[PDB]
Amino acid sequence: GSELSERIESFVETLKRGGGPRSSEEMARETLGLLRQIITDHRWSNAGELMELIRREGRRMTAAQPSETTVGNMVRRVLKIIREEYGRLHGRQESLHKLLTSDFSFHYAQLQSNIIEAINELLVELEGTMENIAAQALEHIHSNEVIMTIGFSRTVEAFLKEAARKRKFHVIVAECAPFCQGHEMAVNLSKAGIETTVMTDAAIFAVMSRVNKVIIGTKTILANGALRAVTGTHTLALAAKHHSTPLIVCAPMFKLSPQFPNEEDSFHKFVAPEEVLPFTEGDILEKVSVHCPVFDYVPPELITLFISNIGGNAPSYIYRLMSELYHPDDHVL
Amino acid sequence: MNSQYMFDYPAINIDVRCHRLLSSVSYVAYNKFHTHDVSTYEHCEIPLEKLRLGFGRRNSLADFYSLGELPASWGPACYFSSVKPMMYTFQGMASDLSRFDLTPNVLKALSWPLGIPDCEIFSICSDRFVRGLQTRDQLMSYILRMGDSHSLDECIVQAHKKILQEARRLGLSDEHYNGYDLFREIGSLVCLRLINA
Amino acid sequence: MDDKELIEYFKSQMKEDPDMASAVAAIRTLLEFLKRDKGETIQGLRANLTSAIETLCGVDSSVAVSSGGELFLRFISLASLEYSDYSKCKKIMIERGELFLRRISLSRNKIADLCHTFIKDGATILTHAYSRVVLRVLEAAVAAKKRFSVYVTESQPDLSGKKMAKALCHLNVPVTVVLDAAVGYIMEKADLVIVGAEGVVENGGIINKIGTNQMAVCAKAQNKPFYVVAESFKFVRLFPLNQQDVPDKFKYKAEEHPWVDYTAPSLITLLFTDLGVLTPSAVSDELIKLYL
Amino acid sequence: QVPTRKDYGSKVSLFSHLPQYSRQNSLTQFMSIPSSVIHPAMVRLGLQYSQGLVSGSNARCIALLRALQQVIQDYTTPPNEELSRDLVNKLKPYMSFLTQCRPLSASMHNAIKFLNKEITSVGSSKREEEAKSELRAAIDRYVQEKIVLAAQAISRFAYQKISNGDVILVYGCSSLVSRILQEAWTEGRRFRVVVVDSRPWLEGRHTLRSLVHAGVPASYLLIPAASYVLPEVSKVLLGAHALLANGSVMSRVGTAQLALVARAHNVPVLVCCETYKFCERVQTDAFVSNELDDPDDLQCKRGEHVALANWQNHASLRLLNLVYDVTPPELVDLVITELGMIPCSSVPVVLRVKSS
């Protein structure tokens, strides 16, 4: 009750004010733990009340920070898990087959235990996601290869550190200005023994002619295979497409969102202009419009491969993955 | 292809000792898409393993297999037929002769087309006879035993060809014998031979 | 049921409700044929339905009619797979057909409600010719209090583009009419292209009025998104390799003037169907899921 | 145990992670006669693998399955052990030896997975003779349904896409392509075939002979001249060694190049493959996973002098004999399988419906 309410309020305020969990996996774990706490603590008779309350909590969580899709992704995953559990315990996708062939009020005592067990299994699968993704590094990196990365991605870092145990290759890291987080990635990879280069975004095209493949992370994967990545990733994808350089996205399955690129102006995250133009400029700040978008939209035609904890896939298959994770009625939430 | 789903499949059993007798066609549940196309005649499904599916509204059955094809559906059972429907004589004669059993010149006249005397065609052409699921097996077995082949479509083609040859021998016009109902044609030809002999 | 009354019912249902499309009228005629068939075997039922489909496609040379024919044959095949007894199978078929008709009658509004969110305020929409689904999506977008300017092509062989312009000015949407040859001139002023389709082929491409391929190629050259709004029952298992590979029964009778053309899936961004917003690669999957 | 085959020559640095053997060198020279640790059928099969006596993917799969049937027939379970575990544990070193003789093809990998799954599913209480007979019958049924019926269905499908008077371009040797062409000609289609070949295997000649024996008019040329002949070509028919989960086609080297040149000339590219060669793995280039054949095969006698003779005397010289390449899905117009005519993007879909 009070503990649950204060935990929810703290989570919402942390999302609204930023900071909190740097790791996306940590954010997913905290979201799942909070959802489990709501399921255990909150009182509900039938599954319909659970749907309504989880939907309200997820709506509040995503309204706190719409650019943080992992929270909504986990909320929809929990809703799908609850729906599947109810269908298994009570009963026995839209398609041409279903179209040709063709009630949550009922109550069950053991449904809650099954829901918690499924959520715990999901958490266990989430725990080993990074190792599962990194275990595929040797199948995609050959000897004396050149890899291009932008910003700081922990999944890509684990990928490269696992590949470096048996192969020698070069990694080029482009800083993601203004938050030049690529410097930390470069120094980490150098500490791991990999030979690394640090450069600004302005050189992304210039050196792309000498890059064998591009390995990047993302914040979100849309239903059509599009990316909500850090800013400057669209230019990197365009430069890779110019040279037909394969672009690999190493992203866990919990970053898949059933949304579509129809949404406008809430996609990119806009922050204080101080990052781009300092406050000490003076009077010219009065008449100059300064905008600092954090995220970028990447169309699916610029992506070659998705590597996740379940293996490799093409963007054209992303829809099927989206069909296996979320019910079509939970996209609106 | 929707033209390949088959509700039942014709299993063909052929005895080496005598093709004209005891060679049978049964029907077994298939409920799956076949490898080839299917032709439907008198609620009977024939796999088109040796002939190809054809389209149009050509008058005669021979007009199709002369091109190496078979129509999808034709005959009395289908409401709209690729061939042009026609009638044949002596059907009532066959209906009355139905009660005659197999027990000189009459035996020679009625030996066609098997070469052994038969009275099953009279049961085929009788008015009490009703086409449906129960009569697929014996009808297809008669077609199989008449011709010399292991394929049902080839047997049908050979049966129509021999019908046309007998009609030419007896002097009837080709247009009257096109193949809308093969077994009514057999009954008419047999009755004509009987009254001749 | 005679062939003459079949054609009469088809034409009557086409004329009575001009809003309803040809494929829906064909499927309704086939279901009405199945309603009163006085038969006893499913084999003759399938043969009679196939012959009815051939004569109906003789009436209208549109791809959508044949799409509905194959879809309906698959529906009968699945229903027969469910039940062996003819009477129980037939009653299951009639109830399932009524439900199928109800569901396909309301596909247009689902496509509109799912596609109107891709239109932005102040956008410039290019469309090819008359298509009731595009009219419906634009009506829904206007009902969403959105302001946009629509361009349409006059569609020379039959000026259905002018009909589209009139039906759009009916609701006071700012629309303009350009020639078939002016399409390449207009692409740079438009923001996105939205077209319909008379048939959706296996690989995700579409069959549509003769001017669709030009717009697809021009939009690809100018990096503009190309959206296709189409119904589920327009999913033919066809695989055209080029423009010549399109069956001739759809090109003509509907110097040499074809009435349709084929657009490759690589020129299409998204497909808006009653199944949802799909990539072209999804469509093939659907067909593979339908035929076992 | 079984010793490790020694790498021959110096490999390219980008391909240094792959093994590279010599055809003359054989593992059996260090193994006992009669063979004890390795079954004699395995030894013979590996000997003909390393020497190239069988080369086709279907042929390699069939030979492996027949040898495995022989091994299963000769097998006896040991006391206090189970069939489902002991048979797999015994088969693993045989697969290692076969991989040492020559890297396993995708069809071989899928067949090995199928047989391992079938053996693991053998009941604990099931008798030995019955289990062996069922394993042999399962292998026979797998061969039948995954090769013969699949080829018949693919030929029937491809007949619809062949018209009178068209020109079809084929590459290398593929039993499926030759069967399709022969049956299309037999059914009544009248056309001509253009055969493209490449060094050093020159396996396209095989197909050429088949065509000549079927009465089909044929033309022959090498791969570099393909761009000359594509103006008169109407369609391109290619066989696949494997189809990957992203839709890319893993095939003999030079297939992706032919697809690219065909795209430049605006001709469709058709790929025929059986669904049992579909692979779950993904691959973006020919460098990460490939096979390094014998470099000495690249030597050719042009005139009276062989330039590449004693090539290892030069320290900086390297000889690269790639076996496979990868065609991106965007260069393939249509895939012909026993399920029907599907695009490359539908390859994972099939992988989803074949599994369950």
Curated annotation (Swiss-Prot), chain A:
Question: Where is the protein situated, by its record's location annotation?
Answer: Cytoplasm, Cytosol
Q: Name one GO cellular component term.
A: cytoplasm
Write down the superkingdom of origin. Answer: Eukaryota
GO BP terms in the entry? central nervous system development; cytoplasmic translational initiation; myelination; oligodendrocyte development; ovarian follicle development; regulation of translational initiation; response to glucose; response to heat
| One Pfam family named in its UniProt record | IF-2B
Which Gene Ontology molecular function entries are recorded, alphabetically? ATP binding; GTP binding; guanyl-nucleotide exchange factor activity; translation initiation factor activity
Q: Could you say which disease the record links this protein to?
A: Leukoencephalopathy with vanishing white matter 2: An autosomal recessive brain disease characterized by neurological features including progressive cerebellar ataxia, spasticity, and cognitive deficits. Brain imaging shows abnormal white matter that vanishes over time and is replaced by cerebrospinal fluid. Disease severity ranges from fatal infantile forms to adult forms without neurological deterioration. The disease is progressive with, in most individuals, additional episodes of rapid deterioration following febrile infections or minor head trauma.
Family that this chain belongs to: Belongs to the eIF-2B alpha/beta/delta subunits family.
Q: What is this protein called?
A: Translation initiation factor eIF2B subunit beta
Species this protein is from: Homo sapiens
Swiss-Prot record, chain B:
Source organism superkingdom: Viruses
Q: Which family does it belong to?
A: Belongs to the phlebovirus NS-S protein family.
State the protein's name.
Non-structural protein NS-S
Native organism is Sandfly fever sicilian virus
| Included stretch of the parent chain | 7 to 210 of 267
From Swiss-Prot, chain C:
Q: How is its activity regulated?
A: Activated by the chemical integrated stress response (ISR) inhibitor ISRIB which stimulates guanine nucleotide exchange factor activity for both phosphorylated and unphosphorylated eIF2.
First-listed, main subcellular location of the protein, grouped into a coarse class = cytoplasm
GO molecular-function term, one example from the UniProt record: identical protein binding
Q: Which residues carry this modification: N6-acetyllysine?
A: 35
Q: Which superkingdom?
A: Eukaryota
Task: Please give the SUPFAM superfamilies that the UniProt record associates with this protein.
Answer: NagB/RpiA/CoA transferase-like
BP-aspect Gene Ontology terms: cytoplasmic translational initiation; oligodendrocyte development; response to glucose; response to heat; response to peptide hormone; T cell receptor signaling pathway; translational initiation
Any one Gene Ontology cellular component term annotated for this protein: membrane
What is any Pfam family matched here? IF-2B
Q: Where does the record place a coiled coil? A: none
Keywords noted in UniProt: Acetylation, Cytoplasm, Disease variant, Initiation factor, Leukodystrophy, Protein biosynthesis
Does Cytoplasm appear among the keywords? yes
| Subcellular location field | Cytoplasm, Cytosol
Please verify whether the record's keywords include Transcription. Answer: no
For this chain, the family text in UniProt reads: Belongs to the eIF-2B alpha/beta/delta subunits family.
Outline the subunit composition.
Component of the translation initiation factor 2B (eIF2B) complex which is a heterodecamer of two sets of five different subunits: alpha, beta, gamma, delta and epsilon. Subunits alpha, beta and delta comprise a regulatory subcomplex and subunits epsilon and gamma comprise a catalytic subcomplex. Within the complex, the hexameric regulatory complex resides at the center, with the two heterodimeric catalytic subcomplexes bound on opposite sides.
Put simply, this protein is called Translation initiation factor eIF2B subunit alpha
State the species of origin.
Homo sapiens
**Gene name in the database record:** EIF2B1
Curated annotation (Swiss-Prot), chain D:
What is the superkingdom listed in this entry's lineage?
A: Eukaryota
Keyword Lipid biosynthesis in the entry? The reply is no
UniProt region (May bind the chemical integrated stress response (ISR) inhibitor ISRIB), positions on chain: 5-14
Q: Name one GO molecular function term.
A: translation initiation factor activity
Q: Which GO terms describe its biological process?
A: cytoplasmic translational initiation; myelination; oligodendrocyte development; ovarian follicle development; regulation of translation; response to glucose; response to heat; response to peptide hormone
Q: Mind listing the UniProt keywords for this protein, alphabetically?
A: Acetylation, Cytoplasm, Disease variant, Initiation factor, Leukodystrophy, Phosphoprotein, Protein biosynthesis
Q: How is its activity regulated?
A: Activated by the chemical integrated stress response (ISR) inhibitor ISRIB which stimulates guanine nucleotide exchange factor activity for both phosphorylated and unphosphorylated eIF2.
Cell compartment(s), UniProt: Cytoplasm, Cytosol
Q: Which disease is it linked to?
A: Leukoencephalopathy with vanishing white matter 4: An autosomal recessive brain disease characterized by neurological features including progressive cerebellar ataxia, spasticity, and cognitive deficits. Brain imaging shows abnormal white matter that vanishes over time and is replaced by cerebrospinal fluid. Disease severity ranges from fatal infantile forms to adult forms without neurological deterioration. The disease is progressive with, in most individuals, additional episodes of rapid deterioration following febrile infections or minor head trauma.
Write out the similarity annotation: Belongs to the eIF-2B alpha/beta/delta subunits family.
Q: What is this protein called?
A: Translation initiation factor eIF2B subunit delta
What's the name of its gene?
EIF2B4
